[PDB]
Amino acid sequence: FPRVKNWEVGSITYDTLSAQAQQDGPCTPRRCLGSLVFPRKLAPEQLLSQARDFINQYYSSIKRSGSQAHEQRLQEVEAEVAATGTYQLRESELVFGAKQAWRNAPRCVGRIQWGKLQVFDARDCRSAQEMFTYICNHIKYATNRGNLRSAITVFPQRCPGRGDFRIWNSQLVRYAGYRQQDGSVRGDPANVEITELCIQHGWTPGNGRFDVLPLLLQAPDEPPELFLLPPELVLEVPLEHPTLEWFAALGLRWYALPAVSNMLLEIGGLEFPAAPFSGWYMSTEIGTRNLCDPHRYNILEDVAVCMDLDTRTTSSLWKDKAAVEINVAVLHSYQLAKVTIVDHHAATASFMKHLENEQKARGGCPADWAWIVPPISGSLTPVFHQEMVNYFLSPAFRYQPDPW
Amino acid sequence: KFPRVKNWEVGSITYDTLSAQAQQDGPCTPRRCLGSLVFPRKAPEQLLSQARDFINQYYSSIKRSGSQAHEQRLQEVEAEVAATGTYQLRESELVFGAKQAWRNAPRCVGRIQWGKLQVFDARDCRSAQEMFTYICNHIKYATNRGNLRSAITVFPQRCPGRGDFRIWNSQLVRYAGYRQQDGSVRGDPANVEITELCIQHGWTPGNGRFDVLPLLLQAPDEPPELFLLPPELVLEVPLEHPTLEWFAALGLRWYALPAVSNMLLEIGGLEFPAAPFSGWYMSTEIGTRNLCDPHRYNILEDVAVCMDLDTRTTSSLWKDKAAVEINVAVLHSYQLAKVTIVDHHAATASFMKHLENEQKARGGCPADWAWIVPPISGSLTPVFHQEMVNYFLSPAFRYQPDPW
Numbered sequence: 001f002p003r004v005k006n007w008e009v010g011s012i013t014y015d016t017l018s019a020q021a022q023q024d025g026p027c028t029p030r031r032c033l034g035s036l037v038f039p040r041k042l043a044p045e046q047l048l049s050q051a052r053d054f055i056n057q058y059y060s061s062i063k064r065s066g067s068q069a070h071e072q073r074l075q076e077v078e079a080e081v082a083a084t085g086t087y088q089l090r091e092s093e094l095v096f097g098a099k100q101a102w103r104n105a106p107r108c109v110g111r112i113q114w115g116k117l118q119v120f121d122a123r124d125c126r127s128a129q130e131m132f133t134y135i136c137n138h139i140k141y142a143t144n145r146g147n148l149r150s151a152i153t154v155f156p157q158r159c160p161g162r163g164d165f166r167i168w169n170s171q172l173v174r175y176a177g178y179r180q181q182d183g184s185v186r187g188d189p190a191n192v193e194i195t196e197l198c199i200q201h202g203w204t205p206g207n208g209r210f211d212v213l214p215l216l217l218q219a220p221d222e223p224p225e226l227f228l229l230p231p232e233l234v235l236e237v238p239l240e241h242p243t244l245e246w247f248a249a250l251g252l253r254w255y256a257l258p259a260v261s262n263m264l265l266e267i268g269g270l271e272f273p274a275a276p277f278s279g280w281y282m283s284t285e286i287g288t289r290n291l292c293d294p295h296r297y298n299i300l301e302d303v304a305v306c307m308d309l310d311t312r313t314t315s316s317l318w319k320d321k322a323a324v325e326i327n328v329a330v331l332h333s334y335q336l337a338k339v340t341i342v343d344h345h346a347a348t349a350s351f352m353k354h355l356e357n358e359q360k361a362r363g364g365c366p367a368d369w370a371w372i373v374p375p376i377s378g379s380l381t382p383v384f385h386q387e388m389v390n391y392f393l394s395p396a397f398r399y400q401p402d403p404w
Numbered sequence: 405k406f407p408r409v410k411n412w413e414v415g416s417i418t419y420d421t422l423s424a425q426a427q428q429d430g431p432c433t434p435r436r437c438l439g440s441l442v443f444p445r446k447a448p449e450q451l452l453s454q455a456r457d458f459i460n461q462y463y464s465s466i467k468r469s470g471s472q473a474h475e476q477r478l479q480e481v482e483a484e485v486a487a488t489g490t491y492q493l494r495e496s497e498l499v500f501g502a503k504q505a506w507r508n509a510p511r512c513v514g515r516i517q518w519g520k521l522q523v524f525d526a527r528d529c530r531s532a533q534e535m536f537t538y539i540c541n542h543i544k545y546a547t548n549r550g551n552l553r554s555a556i557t558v559f560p561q562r563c564p565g566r567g568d569f570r571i572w573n574s575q576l577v578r579y580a581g582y583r584q585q586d587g588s589v590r591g592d593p594a595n596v597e598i599t600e601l602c603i604q605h606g607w608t609p610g611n612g613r614f615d616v617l618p619l620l621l622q623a624p625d626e627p628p629e630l631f632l633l634p635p636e637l638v639l640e641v642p643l644e645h646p647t648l649e650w651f652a653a654l655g656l657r658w659y660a661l662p663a664v665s666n667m668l669l670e671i672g673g674l675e676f677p678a679a680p681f682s683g684w685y686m687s688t689e690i691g692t693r694n695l696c697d698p699h700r701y702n703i704l705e706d707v708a709v710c711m712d713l714d715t716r717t718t719s720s721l722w723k724d725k726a727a728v729e730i731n732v733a734v735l736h737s738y739q740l741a742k743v744t745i746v747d748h749h750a751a752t753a754s755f756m757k758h759l760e761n762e763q764k765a766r767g768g769c770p771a772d773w774a775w776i777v778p779p780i781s782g783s784l785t786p787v788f789h790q791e792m793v794n795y796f797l798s799p800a801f802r803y804q805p806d807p808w
């Protein structure tokens with residue numbers, strides 16, 4: 001039972017929950033690879049064992065373990081799989097599982113919210129046109145005029161034989177990335193290839209560096225088809241700074257809904273290759289990673305010139321200055337636009353509050369220190385000073401091969 | 405079957421083949437990662453097997469592997485263990501061994517410099533008194549009027565029949581920390597304990613915030629003897645801000661020389677429980693950590709208030725702005741005072757070049773990601789976007805329990 005220490009306060013806890021971890025990670029006694037982005041690189045009696053485990057923790061969570069429908073529910077799943085091969089989750093189960101998977105995501109710092117999540121059951125989806133509308137309710141419910149609300153939309157569970165439901169964008173909202181003669185990129189370089197894939201599937205390209213990509217929706221077997229997004233659904237926030245009057249002129253924007261459409265949801269041994277979830281942003285996500293990363297928008301030097309900073313020596317800390325202002329402008333702009341956004345201090349502190357809750361409840365909490373600590377001011381936040389154990393619980397969100 | 409490691413800023417891929425030589429064992433299993441633990445740790449035949457390895461490394465590096473002088477040294481060593489249960493390092497072997505320990509230190513961002521290390525051989529040392537003299541000398545050579553040099557002093561190896569040489573002080577230069585009427589601490593809270601010890605061993609405490617502590621030096625089978633550092637030996641840098649003239653009225657200071665004095669040095673099974681070593685500071689250790697940590701000097705709010713920042717709300721990023729100014733002061737005061745210092749941007753850049761040097765050389769490089777990334781501006785620096793393999797090689801520096 002790992003002794004975990006907090007070094008800011010001197011407190012000590014034990015992670016007993018780690019004990020019940022299953023799907024083995026990447027690390028060994030001889031070398032730690034906790035800093036890898038992809039940990040686990042990418043006869044049906046394995047289905048049942050995973051299934052009984054989820055069902056047991058389901059009834060555990062409602063007290064009704066032992067006797068009652070608990071006893072009963074084990075048989076239905078048993079018989080279902082015995083007959084069919086796969087099984088269907090009761091609707092309440094699918095809601096329980098989806099929340100658990102969130103609660104088990106080690107790299108997410110928003111888990112203090114894990115209990116408040118809106119699940120939309122689209123297991124009766126059957127078409128790309130059908131997927132599209134489902135996506136469009138979600139985005140509408142999630143966005144909610146900038147009063148953002150955590151939502152997941154679950155599409156049919158992958159079944160033995162015959163193809164998957166899948167979304168080809170990594171997110172629902174993505175800006176375009178265009179190559180050229182230079183080999184450089186106008187727009188967002190993170191989305192250069194999916195822009196490549198859009199155009200070659202019949203999308204008329206665009207102007208420049210904030211062009212919302214269209215979706216690519218893949219119904220089982222049948223190849224993908226584009227689906228243009230309604231401009232009013234895709235809520236955005238133009239970027240201005242509270243005191244640096246020139247910032248708006250730079251013409252920076254960013255969307256309101258972070259919504260991931262490529263990760264694979266697993267509950268009770270069932271794989272959902274299409275299960276888009278959305279929450280709301282932490283400001284450093286936009287201000288530090290998306291706009292400042294050398295391989296993203298890389299705007300840091302442009303902001304620094306306009307601030308008339310000394311970019312000639314790295315010891316003026318012009319990078320650190322520019323970056324704080326780019327962050328101040330993000331929080332400001334989202335607030336002016338009355339769109340839900342959380343700063344990193346506010347967020348990390350709430351995560352600490354989550355760790356203590358998760359101690360009392362489950363005897364621990366799987367966390368990925370490198371992803372929980374923010375990309376700026378790491379040591380200024382409490383989670384820097386907090387030892388963390390990382391492991392894999394089910395249900396969870398996994399990564400999956402892209403469909404190319 | 406060697407770890408694939410990717411640089412996410414540039415897209416580079418390399419495999420860490422050096423990790424498969426990992427001579428000791430870390431805290432991680434495939435069930436759970438524990439890389440965020442500060443303390444990831446805690447017979448003649450084994451002393452031989454460690455020793456043979458070191459000797460092998462040594463004769464590899466002088467391009468004289470598998471030769472007369474090599475097999476000589478093996479036979480000589482494994483026969484000296486027979487007669488005494490120990491063996492002695494030749495001086496050249498000691499110098500190579502001290503560098504390697506630095507080279508292998510996974511938590512050191514300044515390893516680009518590993519080859520330029522001045523090794524003082526004090527294995528003939530005889531008392532706590534000769535010990536003090538050797539230390540004063542180390543401080544004098546290393547400080548060098550503000551133009552700092554890397555050195556290490558190696559006191560006599562742990563041996564059968566005798567007690568250890570031990571320096572009780574975590575670092576050669578440390579500020580006192582005094583408990584209070586409030587129950588609070590005056591000066592540096594990291595050194596409340598050592599301060600307690602010094603006082604009880606006859607030191608006459610001051611009452612300032614930057615009272616330099618005396619040394620407690622332990623010669624074999626002797627109580628620790630207390631030694632005052634000659635004031636003119638301890639070069640300090642008074643902290644001022646280049647455009648916030650009220651800053652100098654904080655009365656903040658720091659010392660030039662980061663000399664760690666309580667770590668064990670391990671060479672071919674031989675253990676040196678006293679071998680103080682020193683480099684020069686990276687500005688964040690002073691700016692971010694030593695001053696802004698809530699549990700250290702904790703000046704963050706007091707600076708931010710003085711900056712007339714709005715400390716009511718976190719979304720104002722008051723913590724981040726105040727921190728960036730504290731760092732700017734550190735780099736500036738030190739540059740003014742003509743006292744060597746490196747910024748985290750410059751530091752992280754040379755570390756990347758180190759990783760590149762190391763891959764060509766040994767096919768890899770041990771690195772603790774969460775230590776390498778600066779406690780501010782992580783993603784702004786290149787080490788944020790680099791995956792790293794953590795493992796233990798020998799020679800090495802290790803933590804060791806306090807002798808009290």
Ligand code: HEM
Nearest residue numbers: 102105107108109110113150152277278279280281282397
């Ligand atoms: C509601 C507010 C939320 C906040 C503030 C939040 C915060 C974050 C942040 C900052 C990340 C880092 C991702 C990155 O930097 O690339 C993250 C990742 C993640 N979040 Fe949350 N999140 C929220 C909602 C949700 C919801 C609703 C779910 C699932 C239903 C979720 C599950 C995840 C997962 C699985 C990851 C890992 C992403 C990956 O590995 O690519 N989060 N979260």
Ligand code: HEM
Nearest residue numbers: 506509511512513514517554555681682683684685686801
């Ligand atoms: C010359 C410039 C040097 C720089 C800029 C530098 C930088 C650093 C920094 C920033 C840390 C982390 C400190 C902390 O987080 O508390 C560290 C740790 C460490 N460094 Fe270096 N260093 C230098 C020289 C040296 C030398 C000369 C040695 C040994 C011969 C060394 C060996 C180590 C070791 C063993 C650690 C781990 C200390 C621990 O675990 O507490 N470094 N270094």
Ligand SMILES: Cc1cc(CCNCc2ccc3c(C)cc(N)nc3c2)ccc1C#N
Nearest residue numbers: 037258259260277278279280281282285399
């Ligand atoms: C595997 C991978 C992962 C990532 C990170 C993607 N995760 C982004 C994300 C995903 C979900 C979020 C959610 C749900 C909320 C939020 N505030 N931010 C979120 C951010 C980037 C590139 C790769 C790659 N290759």
Ligand SMILES: Cc1cc(CCNCc2ccc3c(C)cc(N)nc3c2)ccc1C#N
Nearest residue numbers: 442662663664681682683684685686689803
């Ligand atoms: C185990 C432990 C470790 C640390 C880390 C302290 N390391 C300090 C250090 C040690 C050597 C340095 C060197 C050699 C150079 C440099 N710039 N900074 C250095 C800083 C702090 C508290 C504890 C505790 N308890």
Ligand SMILES: C[C@H](O)[C@H](O)[C@H]1CNc2nc(N)[nH]c(=O)c2N1
Nearest residue numbers: 035036370371412788789790791
């Ligand atoms: C190699 C390293 O793990 C990688 O760059 C990680 C570090 N931490 C991160 N943390 C978050 N939230 N998002 C990221 O993309 C990354 N990148």
Ligand SMILES: C[C@H](O)[C@H](O)[C@H]1CNc2nc(N)[nH]c(=O)c2N1
Nearest residue numbers: 384385386387440441774775776
């Ligand atoms: C618990 C946590 O890992 C701990 O506070 C670490 C994080 N990374 C660090 N990195 C460095 N360089 N120095 C440190 O003291 C720490 N502290």
Ligand SMILES: [Cl-]
Nearest residue numbers: 258285286290
């Ligand atoms: Cl994003």
Ligand SMILES: [Cl-]
Nearest residue numbers: 575662689694
């Ligand atoms: Cl220090």
Ligand SMILES: [Gd]
Nearest residue numbers: 305306307308
């Ligand atoms: Gd101007």
Ligand SMILES: [Gd]
Nearest residue numbers: 646647648649
């Ligand atoms: Gd001024």
Ligand SMILES: [Zn+2]
Nearest residue numbers: 027032432437
């Ligand atoms: Zn690990």
